[PDB]
Amino acid sequence: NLRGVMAALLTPFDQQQALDKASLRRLVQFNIQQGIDGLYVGGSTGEAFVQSLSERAQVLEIVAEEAKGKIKLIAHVGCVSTAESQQLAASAKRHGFDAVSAVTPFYYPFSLEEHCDHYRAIIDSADGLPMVVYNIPALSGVKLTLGQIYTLVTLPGVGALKQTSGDLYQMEQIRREHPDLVLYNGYDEIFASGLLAGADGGIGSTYNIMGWRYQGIVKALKEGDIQTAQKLQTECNKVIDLLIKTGIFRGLKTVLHYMDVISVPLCRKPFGPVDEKCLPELKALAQQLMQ
Amino acid sequence: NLRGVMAALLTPFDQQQALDKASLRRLVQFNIQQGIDGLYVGGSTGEAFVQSLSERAQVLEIVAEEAKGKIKLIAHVGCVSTAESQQLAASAKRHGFDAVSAVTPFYYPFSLEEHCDHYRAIIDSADGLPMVVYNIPALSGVKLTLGQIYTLVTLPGVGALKQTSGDLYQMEQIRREHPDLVLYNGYDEIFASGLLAGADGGIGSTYNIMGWRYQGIVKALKEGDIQTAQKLQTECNKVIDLLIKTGIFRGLKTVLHYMDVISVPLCRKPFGPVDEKCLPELKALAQQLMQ
Amino acid sequence: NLRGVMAALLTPFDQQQALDKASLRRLVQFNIQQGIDGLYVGGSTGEAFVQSLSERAQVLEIVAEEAKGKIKLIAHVGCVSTAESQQLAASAKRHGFDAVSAVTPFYYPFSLEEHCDHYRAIIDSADGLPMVVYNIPALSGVKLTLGQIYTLVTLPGVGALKQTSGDLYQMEQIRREHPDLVLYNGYDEIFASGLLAGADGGIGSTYNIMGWRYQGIVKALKEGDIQTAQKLQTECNKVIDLLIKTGIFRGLKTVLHYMDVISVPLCRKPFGPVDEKCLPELKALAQQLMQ
Amino acid sequence: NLRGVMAALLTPFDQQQALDKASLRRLVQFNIQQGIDGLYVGGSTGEAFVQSLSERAQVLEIVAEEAKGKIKLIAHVGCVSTAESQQLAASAKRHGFDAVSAVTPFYYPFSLEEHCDHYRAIIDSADGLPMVVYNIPALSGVKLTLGQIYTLVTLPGVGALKQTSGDLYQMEQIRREHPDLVLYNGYDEIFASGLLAGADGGIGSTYNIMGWRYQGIVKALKEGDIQTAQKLQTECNKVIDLLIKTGIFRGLKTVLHYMDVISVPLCRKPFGPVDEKCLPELKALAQQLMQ
Secondary structure (H helix, E strand, O other): OOOEEEEOOOOOOOOOOOEOOOHHHHHHHHHHHHOOOEEEEEHHOOHHHOOHHHHHHHHHHHHHHHOOEEEEOOOOOOOOOOOHHHHHHHHHHHOOOOOOEEOOOOOOOOOHHHHHHHHHHHHHOOOOOOOEEEHHHHHHHHOOOOHHHHHOOOOOOOOEEEEOOOOOOHHHHHHHHOOOOOEEOOOOOHHHHHHHHHHOEEEOOOOHHHHHHHHHHHHHHHHHHHHHHHHHHHHHHHHHHHHHHHHHHHHHHHHHHOOOOOOOOOOOOOOOOOOOOHHHHHHHHHHHHOO | OEEEEEEEOOOOOOOOEEEEHHHHHHHHHHHHHOOOOOEOOOOOOHHHOOOHHHHHHHHHHHHHHHHHHOOOEEEEOOOHHHHHHHHHHHHHHHHHHHEEEEEOOOOOOOOOHHHHHHHHHHHHHHHOEEEEEEEEEHOOOOOHHHHHHHHHHHHOOEEEEEEEOOOHHHHHHHHHOOOOEEEEEOOHHHHHHHHHHHOOOOEEHHHHHHHHHHHHHHHHHHOHHHHHHHHHHHHHHHHHHHHHHHHHHHHHHHHHHHHOOOOOOOOOOOOOOOHHHHHHHHHHHHHHOOO | OOEEEEEOOOOOOOOOOOOOHHHHHHHHHHHHHHOOOOEOOHHHHOOOOOHHHHHHHHHHHHHHHHHEEOEEEEEOOOOOOHHHHHHHHHHHHOOOEEEEEEEEEOOOOHHHHHHHHHHHOOOHHOOOOEEEEEEEEEHHHOOHHHHHHHHHHOOOEEEEEEEEEOOHHHHHHHHOOOOOEEEEOOOOOHHHHHHOOOOOOEEOOOOOHHHHHHHHHHHHHHOOOOHHHHHHHHHHHHHHHHHHHHHHHHHHHHHOOOOOOOOOEEEEEEEEOOOOHHHHHHHHHHHHHOO | OOOEEEOOOOOOOOOOEEOOOHHHHHHEEEEEEEOEEEEOHHHHHHHHHHHHHHHHHHHHHHHHHOOOOOOHHHHHHHHOOOOHHHHHHHHHHHHOOOOEEEOOOOOOOOOOOHHHHHHHHHHHHOOOOOOEEEOOHHHOOOOOOOOHHHHHOOOOEEEEEEEOOOHHHHHHHHHHHHOEEEEEEEHHHHHHHHHHHHOOEEOEEEOOOOOOHHEEEEHHHOOHHHHHHHHHHHHHHHHHHHHHHOOHHHHHHHHHHHHHOOOOOOOOOOOOOOOHHHHHHHHHHOOOOOO
């Protein structure tokens, strides 16, 4: 019941880089208005790693207030620290999120056994809430093999995997070995191909400004209209090429600003500002997006 | 007219590791009776880098005597040396192949300008036959960017790209920037996902024993039957799982010996023999496929 | 004056994983009793990335109260977030630390410019105090090019570079490029060869249990006696080989325990515990080191 | 008897890319005049992978004719194919070389056992001449582990290891495990540090134009004069810095040409010509090298 298209919610900030509560609620409502199935909060896209636990706990709360009931809620609780991750997991259940999620602890090299204990400890604190293992090798440096995945996803309490890997052979191998596992496609650039390989849903950053397109891809593939699926994916990637140039997060925010959703499209340092030269294209994208 | 499903032809050897002509002719006929759109010969799968220019040219001649007119024929003439590649290319033209192809020169690092000159020289010796740029990072050690690809595929005489990369984001980008370029999916394990992202056909080594499934996945994606495309793809991946454990070339060769096509299923040294413990699975697969 | 051998300080924890104030002070003096030139505190070796800013700030204070004036004190203030790093920077100034240091912000990919602003900001909040750039690709995932390193170390306020890279050609290039820059050799296993390549110092985690050996390596070379510099390095590596098998940090805290310095050789989660099998070997080590 | 400083011999070609016999002999005599301990012929630097077996056997003969008895002679017989490697190993014995060498087979992935049989077979055909295992991860794509190094180095008939790796931790680990093994440092840019780490001597391409500097580094270390040892290494790295910018083989050949040792400074295709803008620095360097 938690399989589907979930947006990786961004964390709006004000001019002083503090949480822009008013913009956060507006973005959540906006995401809901696009027909998204749920919000994955406190993830990489939410700039959680340059946030304190308190701030992250705060976001979970506001979003739960604005969304609990409307759509599905998944809280990314991950931290390098197990203890910290347990701490946020508790807040997750306490605020009624439908699921908990944690990125493989990074920076320091951890054995497969240590990763399992990390997830066990967190699952424990999630007190019931199912765990969504988060695999994103490009940002974490943890390149999980098929076997390590097997070990992690078969952990009592795990109900899903956020596969942010462009290896679609592994994507189908994972589906084939775990026919009952919820598979989220992490890379928006390959959504259509991800679903075809074995993913039954997705979680992406760009869902925030065009989630209906990804939903459209699910419909077309479901309906057998491969042509339109490619048509939509092509259009998504034209947007993604741009966002990668301008900076994805700041690019997304900037677009939401012109859409009247975000007040100040700033990210937290070390993230820098959007190149002035890019605002015409972003505003334009925002323009057409309001379709 | 190069668009389609081409089998990366294996090179049968006898007990003394010399070319097994009869098995070669047998293998070519087997592929044709299988409904393949053509053959890509002298490539990685053909163990070309473990053959002499003389041996590789002899293969081109035999295959031409057996398949010219029947199916499309692409000759992989690529060597590290430009001069050797040219020699093979003139031999390709002389024997009536439909096109030539060449892996990006490896071992020694070369600049983009040097790869272009390498392809220009070969294209020149190809005297008319279109060129198939062959990108296979995993083996060559040459990781091309979207930009370099652009430059290589826009070279006069270049008519297609054999993409043996699992980066399906890049695959669609290549399709978007080059709408008319023939794009071959290189990794069999992701054929379906490849086609959907922009590939208009493919070249693979497992097409030798089950190319009909790939043609099958093509028809399915054409008739909008995603259901059948997936079913066929996962079946193929179950095979690839096995071949990857036994050794792809040797494995495929053993299955062929069992299908009564190849007299001796050996690969050339340093490639070792198939592990005894694997023969049951390969026998069963042969049996399974024969029906 | 930041030149010399500096031990990368570990932060001892009790059974509940809380900071072991007693053992911390005890460890500091032990390092001094060894004749160390200074301490690099709050870094990777300090399990800093599994601590809160509050805990990191506290450790800074403790250590200072114990060593300010006795030896050189460098404070690793690195955090992904710039604002958090700035906060820890002021605390460094506040407790009279000699220098500040910060790992290249990781996980999220940042541009050279972003990394620059990041360091400037921290240099600013350091209210003076020279900045020690910390380059450790294997943990941060940031592979700095000689050019990028050039941009970072010529930044106003930077007085040193902690090179935890095994590339000794780059090391000598850095030295040749910046004759006035302090170069700390990062990997203990190549200390000798590191100083020979151009490093005039070094910061290591194993210094905590045998800093005198590294001090002896420095002397042996300064005196033109390679023969003993090697013997020492070989010895150090015999140790490091072991520590690698057991888990560098946990292994070190264990040896320190067998040396009555640290109460409980525990690292925080997800860091697991030492292997019961590797205990005796670690005991013998602690035994030999005491001489 | 294989300990020492061996130059990795270049292969001079004429304007039509054919072997230049007169120039090959001069380069041999030239290296001998430099007081080089021996020559490593038919290696990467010799452009062997763009030559035919016939051509590589011809280079072997001529060099033997010019140097057998004068200095040590090692014949790089490596090819991907085990059979071709044996054929060349036979020429080696046939022509009086003191040893054979083979790069780890590349392009196709081979098992450790497969690599072991490759060497056994080479060694068998080497008919008595010892084997020098050649490890160069960067070009081959084969990053052997300390363990695989042990298995290969302990093979019967293996008398040395050409270590073209910048990992000086592994270098010392190899010296430690195999004290009676000849260890050739492979990267000229770290010659001083490699030796200190444990290297017995070295093999390099820049030895062709400045072997004496490397011989200097050796004597400097043997005499406990680390000061001049670095000076020499710094000078070599300034040259290497340039050679890398212009193209190492083509650069060395151009300098040699300006020293009147070789007629045409050409490398074979796909290697391109030296950029005109670089000739000034190359002529200047050749001037001082001649002094």
